[PDB]
């Protein structure tokens, strides 16, 4: 999809737009000897806030050179602390230190 700047500057307030963004991390590298292509990709519209707020993980792949790909995101430790049911019925994470 593409959002025209025209509609962005001319929609009534309360229209809910749906912008799309590429994560370029996993984009293929060009072959070393392949001729340059003409053209330049461009982006006119941008967020004012971080967009990937729901992101748990990213780039679950190996890189053949570096120990981990840049921008790779491990899951938070909290996703995996099963913790304990408490006597109340309240859930708890595991104690961080004894006592």
């Amino acid at each position: 999809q593409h959002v025209d700047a025209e509609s962005i500057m001319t929609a009534p307030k309360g229209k809910l737009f749906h912008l799309q963004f590429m994560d370029g991390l996993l984009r293929p590298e060009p072959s070393a000897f392949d001729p340059p292509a003409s053209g330049e990709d461009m982006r006119l519209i941008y967020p004012l806030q971080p967009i990937s707020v729901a992101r748990s993980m990213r780039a679950i792949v190996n890189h053949n050179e570096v120990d981990r790909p840049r921008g790779a995101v491990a899951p938070s430790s909290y996703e995996m602390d099963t913790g304990t049911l408490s006597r109340n019925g309240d859930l708890l994470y595991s104690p961080v230190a004894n006592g």
């Binding site: 190996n62 890189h63 053949n64 050179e65």
Partner: protein, 49 residues
């Protein structure tokens, strides 16, 4: 018969951390990094005993 391990060998516990993808002459070879020397060997050939 259980063949004895030869004099030059180094004991090494298997671990998923030892093996990895790597560049080596334009191929994504399954490199093994020897825990003592730390050296990476992409090829099954030529690795330390």
């Amino acid at each position: 018969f259980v063949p004895d391990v030869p004099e030059g060998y180094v004991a090494v516990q298997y671990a998923h951390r030892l093996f990895s993808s790597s560049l080596a002459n334009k191929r994504n070879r399954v490199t093994y990094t020897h825990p003592p020397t730390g050296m990476a060997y992409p090829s099954p050939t030529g690795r330390p005993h």
